[PDB]
Design a protein around this ligand. Structure first.
Ligand SMILES: [K+]
Ligand SMILES: [K+]
Ligand SMILES: [K+]
Ligand SMILES: [K+]
Ligand SMILES: [K+]
Ligand SMILES: [K+]
Ligand SMILES: [K+]
Ligand SMILES: [K+]
Ligand SMILES: [K+]
Ligand SMILES: [K+]
Ligand SMILES: [K+]
Ligand SMILES: [K+]
Ligand SMILES: [K+]
Ligand SMILES: [K+]
Ligand SMILES: [K+]
Ligand SMILES: [K+]
Ligand SMILES: [K+]
Ligand SMILES: [K+]
Ligand SMILES: [K+]
Ligand SMILES: [K+]
Ligand SMILES: [K+]
Ligand SMILES: [K+]
Ligand SMILES: [K+]
Ligand SMILES: [K+]
Ligand SMILES: [Mg+2]
Ligand SMILES: [Mg+2]
Ligand SMILES: [Mg+2]
Ligand SMILES: [Mg+2]
Ligand SMILES: [Mg+2]
Ligand SMILES: [Mg+2]
Ligand SMILES: [Mg+2]
Ligand SMILES: [Mg+2]
Ligand SMILES: [Mg+2]
Ligand SMILES: [Mg+2]
Ligand SMILES: [Mg+2]
Ligand SMILES: [Mg+2]
Ligand SMILES: [Mg+2]
Ligand SMILES: [Mg+2]
Ligand SMILES: [Mg+2]
Ligand SMILES: [Mg+2]
Ligand SMILES: [Mg+2]
Ligand SMILES: [Mg+2]
Ligand SMILES: [Mg+2]
Ligand SMILES: [Mg+2]
Ligand SMILES: [Mg+2]
Ligand SMILES: [Mg+2]
Ligand SMILES: [Mg+2]
Ligand SMILES: [Mg+2]
Ligand SMILES: [Mg+2]
Ligand SMILES: [Mg+2]
Ligand SMILES: [Mg+2]
Ligand SMILES: [Mg+2]
Ligand SMILES: [Mg+2]
Ligand SMILES: [Mg+2]
Ligand SMILES: [Mg+2]
Ligand SMILES: [Mg+2]
Ligand SMILES: [Mg+2]
Ligand SMILES: [Mg+2]
Ligand SMILES: [Mg+2]
Ligand SMILES: [Mg+2]
Ligand SMILES: [Mg+2]
Ligand SMILES: [Mg+2]
Ligand SMILES: [Mg+2]
Ligand SMILES: [Mg+2]
Ligand SMILES: [Mg+2]
Ligand SMILES: [Mg+2]
Ligand SMILES: [Mg+2]
Ligand SMILES: [Mg+2]
Ligand SMILES: [Mg+2]
Ligand SMILES: [Mg+2]
Ligand SMILES: [Mg+2]
Ligand SMILES: [Mg+2]
Ligand SMILES: [Mg+2]
Ligand SMILES: [Mg+2]
Ligand SMILES: [Mg+2]
Ligand SMILES: [Mg+2]
Ligand SMILES: [Mg+2]
Ligand SMILES: [Mg+2]
Ligand SMILES: [Mg+2]
Ligand SMILES: [Mg+2]
Ligand SMILES: [Mg+2]
Ligand SMILES: [Mg+2]
Ligand SMILES: [Mg+2]
Ligand SMILES: [Mg+2]
Ligand SMILES: [Mg+2]
Ligand SMILES: [Mg+2]
Ligand SMILES: [Mg+2]
Ligand SMILES: [Mg+2]
Ligand SMILES: [Mg+2]
Ligand SMILES: [Mg+2]
Ligand SMILES: [Mg+2]
Ligand SMILES: [Mg+2]
Ligand SMILES: [Mg+2]
Ligand SMILES: [Mg+2]
Ligand SMILES: [Mg+2]
Ligand SMILES: [Mg+2]
Ligand SMILES: [Mg+2]
Ligand SMILES: [Mg+2]
Ligand SMILES: [Mg+2]
Ligand SMILES: [Mg+2]
Ligand SMILES: [Mg+2]
Ligand SMILES: [Mg+2]
Ligand SMILES: [Mg+2]
Ligand SMILES: [Mg+2]
Ligand SMILES: [Mg+2]
Ligand SMILES: [Mg+2]
Ligand SMILES: [Mg+2]
Ligand SMILES: [Zn+2]
Lengths: 99, 163, 103, 186, 46
RNA sequence: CCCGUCUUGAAACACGGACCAAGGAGUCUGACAUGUGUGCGAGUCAACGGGCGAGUAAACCCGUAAGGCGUAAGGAAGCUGAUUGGUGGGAUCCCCCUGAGGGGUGCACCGCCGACCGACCUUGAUCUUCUGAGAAGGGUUCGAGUGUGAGCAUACCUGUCG
RNA sequence: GCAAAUCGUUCGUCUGACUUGGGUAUAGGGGCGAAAGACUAAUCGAACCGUCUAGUAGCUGGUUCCCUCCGAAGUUUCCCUCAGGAUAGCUGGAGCUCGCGUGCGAGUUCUAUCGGGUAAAGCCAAUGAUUAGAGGCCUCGGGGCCUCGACCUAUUCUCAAACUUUAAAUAGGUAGGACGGCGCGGCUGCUUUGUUGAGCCGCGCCACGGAAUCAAGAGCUCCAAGUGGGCCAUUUUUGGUAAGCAGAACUGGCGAUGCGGGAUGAACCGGAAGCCGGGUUACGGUGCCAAACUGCGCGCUAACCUAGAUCCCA
RNA sequence: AUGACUCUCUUAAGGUAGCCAAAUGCCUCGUCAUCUAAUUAGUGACGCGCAUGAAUGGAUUAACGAGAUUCCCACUGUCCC
RNA sequence: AGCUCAACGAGAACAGAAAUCUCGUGUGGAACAGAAGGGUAAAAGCUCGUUUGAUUCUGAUUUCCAGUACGAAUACGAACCGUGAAAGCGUGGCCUAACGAUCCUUUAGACCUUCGGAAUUCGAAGCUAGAGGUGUCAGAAAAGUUACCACAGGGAUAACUGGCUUGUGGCAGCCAAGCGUUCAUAGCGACGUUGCUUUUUGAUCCUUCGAUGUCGGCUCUUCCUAUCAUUGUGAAGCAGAAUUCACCAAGUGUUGGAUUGUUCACCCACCAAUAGGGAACGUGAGCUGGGUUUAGACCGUCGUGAGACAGGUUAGUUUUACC
RNA sequence: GGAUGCGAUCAUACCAGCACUAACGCACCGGAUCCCAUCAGAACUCCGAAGUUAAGCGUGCUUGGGCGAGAGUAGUACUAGGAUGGGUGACCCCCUGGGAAGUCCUCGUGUUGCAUCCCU
């Protein structure tokens, strides 16, 4: 799957509310924070004796992930997220067919 | 879903008639549909949009909505001990105006005038139709009588064209 | 679990039958407390059976600040304004509360 | 054999008598059994049937709602097989003749103060044996908590049926199934 | 595994029940543009 | 053909049963729900406790800003908070007429469609302490809402759960 | 049984890693073991005693009076779900709203109209399979001008669950008025070049009920039980040589149901039932068993094989 | 006929000394010899050995055994009966 | 927007069956990502132009179906766009599959809400929409062994007998190509075709799991005939002798041994003959216990191991009648 | 009676061969400055009016193919319901009903709306 570097799509920002040029980049999940309430509770639950207190997923089945395109509007500098279908090979700004 | 796709078992139902493929005649797009009209659902295999589920093919319903390219149709559907009023939208290429009520409007007018004519003369009548009743007696003029008898059996004739 | 019913949340999974508090002595408790009050009244005669004088205080929080009720005892500032020494007040049937402020 | 259902017998049940043991109600039933039989009046037949009905089938009628339905019908006598309650939301009470099984203490005082009269069904028989010039009224039958829980289940589409929950708040049936942000909204 | 035996008999015990038909039908799902104008037409009707 | 029992199927070469007496298994309690009876009713409830009293574990009396449930909902929350019905059927009654008739009356209930409160969205003349007020005007959105209350206590059957 | 390990005869060893008494040490996930998971008070692959404890059990067994009325299900979806549960269906109870033939209801037909691709048929129609000759023999290969096969034309035998032009029977959908029709006005922000349409509203007028038959009536709501192993038969039908085999389709039946017939039998035939008298039948019968003819007629059969003798059916 | 020898793929190493249809061999009642009138038994040999093999010890071994097995002599009611 | 494909025919240096070029015919016999079906010709195919409707905001409907969710699809409304002169078309792929809750995490969005004594700034917590996944796909976090074994049950379900069935096994018939020196049928019967039998093995799972004692032999009786011998006969390629085919026929008999636990088999020997079977694969309160099939033990192979082996080996309690 | 423009029905309208046509049309046709267009003014586009009815379009014909209709195939095949019907079975008769399809044979070869124009 090849996606163009730029894309002209609708912008939800109240400034634009219209089609504007967007820059395409791939979304990447951020680092998990230690201060998140869920992490704080888990660390408390795991402390002391009792061993592993939560399930640990083992039976992985998917061989791909839903890649999310990060579209940054050039007018308002705001971001919108657009998932695409599953694919094994993905790139942004690759050489187009024939060219 | 659950073991059957949307168009499963539609090899024959959704196929076009023999030597009736290609361009759709434009009288289909010149039809006028109103609320309350009766239409017969006949899926056209060439038009893949707004096409009803195979169940509604060959069913007659009542028009309850009109859009730019489609008409809303009410179709009865029996589910266990109940009849459901299924409301579906179908593109006009898949619907034909039904002639199931063609005799109603003309019949009402004839009944109204017959009662009006009878009312003026003070003669109570009934405009109801009746099924075919017994025929009256009559005489048939004599003619030459052709005698029919059983045919002697022949084994050689027990085959189309004989043996 | 069957039918449309509220989700049950009965807290009866412990040994609750060992912690049941019956009230068959409720009539007896009324009798005993009445006898105690009757005995107390004769002991403190002729002092009033209602006990010490209690002050008027407001209810706490926004929900009860419109009403008044009996408090614990008169504040030291109130006693001084009334010209009653704090050490003499409890001996003449006046309740004293050294904690209460006057805002 | 005979090809019938349940031997041709009815499988429907209706009340042929009051379930109550109230001696006064039974006397009223005897009174209106006679009136319905010996007059053939449709009013008497309706009154007799409604005397059999249960409490929920004899809902109360508020005084305010009684006044609105009696507007422009001063001559007619209002008849209610049920209880008449007082309504503080009604200010002006015109004089009216009302017959009911029971009047609340406040409702009776307001009607009597306004020059009206509170009648029982034995007094009505003397004034309107056939129900002449009567305004027959019924209270709201389906205005009660139980009915809100009836009908299609809360979880099915196009349902506004009230669910059974022990408390009201964010933690009581507001999650998955009640909004798009948790699975689906139903 | 599966069978439809006796299912038609069960359906006909109390069925087949046809839905109650009223003079006026629900307008939900009809063209909003048509419905919105109809509401305005009734508002100014006199 | 031997009863009881599980079973598609029992007289069964399926199991229990030698015989008699007596004992022997859907109960009590908490929560909720529908139904019904009763009391009162926009209220209802004497429940902790107090006053007493059959010399008295009962009965009787007491709710003074007590409390529970109800009387208003929507929203995660900050908050805001019901302008008060139209129509098609319909019980009963009244008038005319003596028809499968025509008028007036139109409760309950059901269908249909507005309006009102709130979440969300949208809208802004005219003001204001700059973030609020609100003339007008809204919405295929959402609500366990409103549009002259129906609840509370209590008895019992049945049902779910501990 | 003398005996919860004994008795008889026969056997191993018998100065040694020998036999034995008493004292003493080791205690339960512990001890002790020349090792058999042996032994630890008739208990050992974890003793015994009391307690937690009335431990839990989707599994087995049982579950106590009488008449009366109604009366099932072995099917759907979901579940570490397949001996279970929930869910819908079937069922009871409670009613309520109306109705009395003017019913707006029907496991039925009639009339009008719509859909279909099974049975059959078709190949002398596409696709696929397939037999034989005939003519033309132009042009290609084959071999020896000849010659076989390729080719072309017109014919011909026989075929298809996953082929088909065509195409039934049976079954499926819709419609046959008072929620009808017409006339004159009105509303709109929708629609049109257009008060043009669309829908709705008001008023006036008309409407003998607008096919047959039936209608022990119609609608609505609440609470809840049981059930969620099925089996049999005509017919259609898949797997299998076949099966009292396994699995589906429509209906009925058994299960839950006796009663008459089939000698006997859950399902075949008849037929379903309060307690009785009389009458008459259904299926099946009328030589005896055994209620009813050795009844009145024609023919066939002669079995020295146990002649033959009644749907399912042996 | 067999394969000292050669070629070729290849392993950490390619079972060496020995032993074997063995209490270890499926095929199998293996083949040959021996024991018998006759032997799926016994013994001695043979070995591309389903799946033998060196202190997971290999191959032997006098003496010993209430250990498993075959044969011969004596003996007999085990049997003819 | 323009164009028409597969294939074939007739032509052109190198050039041929097959390069490229020209004309003609050409209903799709091509192509359309993938399975199959359907669909499509101034197109849905091919070649070019411009592009991002593979966009934002809800609700409704269909398929699934409990008329729940998810996935997928359809028809509108309100925005913003693309394309074309325009009508129009476009909310991914011509249509029918290509996918995923709660909790938690992470990202995006709203000069948004809260941190509850009052504030500010970090941090944290909410509201709305996506992403990280559960393939047992309505979604626990999960390796063996037991021959030392236990419990609740199950004839809803295996390992016997019996029952249905008879493929397989066994036995028999019909047709007549041919064999038989000659000669279809003394005796045989290819190619086909019709049956019987329940002494084979399978198929099934109807009965029995609060138990019908599970191999063989020994002993003992009775029964069958599809007749091995014996009695009476017909036929022959029957001279005699012997043998073969067939008929009536179950009265009588059908043995002693080596090896093997065997059933089966094989050999030695005798004999008129050494036929084949049934009776819950007759027969364990009749025996026996060699085998199989508990616990001890050894080998080989397998397994990291505990242990496994329709592989071999040796030792291993056979109860009760008086109804 | 026709043509032309837009059509409706989409073969009785198609395909093949042969023959024929007044007038107005419709065509072929001439040219390449401009708009436009390609390897190519062939096509497309623009401008034009010398020539021709040769083709196209139109009409007619063919013991033509196809297509459409009828007859026949045939009360045949199949089929709903019924039987204590026949038969060892396979299958089949009868009873109350419904009822096809190739071959062969005959016939047909479009109809029609709005507008403009010719015959006038
Ligand atoms: K822990
Ligand atoms: K399939
Ligand atoms: K106490
Ligand atoms: K049982
Ligand atoms: K059993
Ligand atoms: K028994
Ligand atoms: K409930
Ligand atoms: K109160
Ligand atoms: K008080
Ligand atoms: K909110
Ligand atoms: K000794
Ligand atoms: K222990
Ligand atoms: K279970
Ligand atoms: K055909
Ligand atoms: K063919
Ligand atoms: K259930
Ligand atoms: K020894
Ligand atoms: K195009
Ligand atoms: K070409
Ligand atoms: K699962
Ligand atoms: K056989
Ligand atoms: K058993
Ligand atoms: K015995
Ligand atoms: K031993
Ligand atoms: Mg800590
Ligand atoms: Mg730690
Ligand atoms: Mg699913
Ligand atoms: Mg299904
Ligand atoms: Mg406990
Ligand atoms: Mg206090
Ligand atoms: Mg009867
Ligand atoms: Mg009954
Ligand atoms: Mg989440
Ligand atoms: Mg939904
Ligand atoms: Mg059974
Ligand atoms: Mg029994
Ligand atoms: Mg038996
Ligand atoms: Mg049992
Ligand atoms: Mg017993
Ligand atoms: Mg007793
Ligand atoms: Mg109540
Ligand atoms: Mg209060
Ligand atoms: Mg707000
Ligand atoms: Mg609002
Ligand atoms: Mg003794
Ligand atoms: Mg220790
Ligand atoms: Mg020792
Ligand atoms: Mg061991
Ligand atoms: Mg113990
Ligand atoms: Mg117990
Ligand atoms: Mg799960
Ligand atoms: Mg069971
Ligand atoms: Mg249920
Ligand atoms: Mg038809
Ligand atoms: Mg089909
Ligand atoms: Mg077909
Ligand atoms: Mg066929
Ligand atoms: Mg069960
Ligand atoms: Mg089942
Ligand atoms: Mg079975
Ligand atoms: Mg049962
Ligand atoms: Mg019989
Ligand atoms: Mg009788
Ligand atoms: Mg006789
Ligand atoms: Mg070696
Ligand atoms: Mg060896
Ligand atoms: Mg040997
Ligand atoms: Mg020997
Ligand atoms: Mg040896
Ligand atoms: Mg080895
Ligand atoms: Mg070594
Ligand atoms: Mg070894
Ligand atoms: Mg050795
Ligand atoms: Mg030695
Ligand atoms: Mg020794
Ligand atoms: Mg395809
Ligand atoms: Mg889509
Ligand atoms: Mg543009
Ligand atoms: Mg898609
Ligand atoms: Mg495409
Ligand atoms: Mg699409
Ligand atoms: Mg997700
Ligand atoms: Mg979060
Ligand atoms: Mg704080
Ligand atoms: Mg699942
Ligand atoms: Mg374990
Ligand atoms: Mg069984
Ligand atoms: Mg055979
Ligand atoms: Mg043969
Ligand atoms: Mg038994
Ligand atoms: Mg036994
Ligand atoms: Mg026995
Ligand atoms: Mg014989
Ligand atoms: Mg001779
Ligand atoms: Mg014999
Ligand atoms: Mg046998
Ligand atoms: Mg046996
Ligand atoms: Mg025995
Ligand atoms: Mg024994
Ligand atoms: Mg034995
Ligand atoms: Mg043994
Ligand atoms: Mg052992
Ligand atoms: Mg190893
Ligand atoms: Mg042994
Ligand atoms: Mg030119
Ligand atoms: Mg010409
Ligand atoms: Mg012709
Ligand atoms: Zn922007």
């Amino acid at each position: 799957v090849n996606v163009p570097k730029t894309k002209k799509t609708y912008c939800k920002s109240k400034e634009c509310k219209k089609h504007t040029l967007h820059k395409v980049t791939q979304y990447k999940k951020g680092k998990d924070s230690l201060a998140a309430q869920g992490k704080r509770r888990y660390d408390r639950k795991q402390s002391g004796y009792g061993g592993q207190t939560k399930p640990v997923f083992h039976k992985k089945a998917k061989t791909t992930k839903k890649i999310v395109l990060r579209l940054q509007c050039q007018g308002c500098k705001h971001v919108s997220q657009h998932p695409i279908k599953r694919c094994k090979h993905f790139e942004i700004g690759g050489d187009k067919k024939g060219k | 879903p659950a073991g059957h796709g949307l168009r499963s078992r539609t090899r024959d139902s959704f196929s076009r008639a023999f030597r009736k493929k290609g361009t759709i005649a434009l009288s289909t797009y010149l039809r006028i549909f109103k609320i309350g009209d009766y239409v017969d659902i006949k899926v056209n295999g060439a038009i893949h949009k707004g096409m009803p589920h195979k169940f509604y093919h060959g069913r007659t319903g009542r028009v309850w909505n009109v859009t730019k390219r489609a008409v809303g149709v009410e179709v009865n559907k029996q589910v266990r001990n109940k009849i459901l009023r299924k409301r579906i939208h179908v593109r006009i290429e898949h619907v034909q105006q039904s002639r199931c009520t063609e005799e109603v409007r003309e019949r009402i007018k004839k009944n109204d005038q017959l009662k009006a004519d009878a009312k003026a003369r003070g003669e109570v009548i009934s405009t109801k139709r009746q099924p075919l009743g017994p025929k009256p007696g009559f005489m048939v003029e004599g003619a030459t009588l052709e005698t029919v008898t059983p045919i002697p059996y022949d084994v050689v004739n027990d085959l189309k064209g004989g043996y | 679990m069957k039918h449309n019913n509220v989700i049950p949340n009965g807290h009866f999974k412990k040994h609750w039958q060992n912690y049941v508090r019956t009230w068959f002595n409720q009539p007896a408790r009324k009798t005993r407390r009445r006898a105690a009050r009757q005995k107390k009244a004769a002991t403190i005669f002729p002092r009033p059976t209602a006990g010490s004088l209690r002050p008027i205080v407001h209810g706490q929080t926004l929900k009860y600040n419109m009403k008044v009720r009996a408090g614990r005892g008169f504040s030291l500032e109130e006693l001084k304004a009334a010209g009653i020494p704090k050490k003499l007040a409890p001996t003449i049937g006046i309740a004293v509360d050294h904690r209460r402020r006057n805002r | 054999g005979i090809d019938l259902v349940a031997g041709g017998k009815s499988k429907k049940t209706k009340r042929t008598a009051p379930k109550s043991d109230d001696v006064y109600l039974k006397l009223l039933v005897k009174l209106y059994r006679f009136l319905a039989r010996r007059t053939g009046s449709k009013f008497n037949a309706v009154i007799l049937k409604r005397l059999f009905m249960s409490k929920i089938n004899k809902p109360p009628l508020s005084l305010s709602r009684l006044i609105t339905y009696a507007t422009g019908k001063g001559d007619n006598i209002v008849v209610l097989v049920g209880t008449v309650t007082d309504d503080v939301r009604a200010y002006e009470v015109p004089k009216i003749k009302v017959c009911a099984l029971k009047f609340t203490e406040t409702a009776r005082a307001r009607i009597e103060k306004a020059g009206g009269e509170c009648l029982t069904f034995d007094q009505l028989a003397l004034r309107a044996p056939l129900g002449q010039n009567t305004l027959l009224l019924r209270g709201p039958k389906n205005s009660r908590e139980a009915v809100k829980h009836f009908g299609p289940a809360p979880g099915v589409p196009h349902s506004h049926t009230k669910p059974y929950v022990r408390a009201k708040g964010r933690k009581f049936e507001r999650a998955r199934g009640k909004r798009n942000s948790r699975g689906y909204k139903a | 595994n599966h069978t439809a035996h006796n299912q038609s008999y069960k359906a006909h015990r109390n069925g087949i029940k046809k839905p109650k038909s009223h003079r006026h039908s629900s307008t939900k799902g009809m063209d909003p543009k048509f419905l919105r104008n109809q509401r305005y037409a009734r508002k100014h009707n006199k």
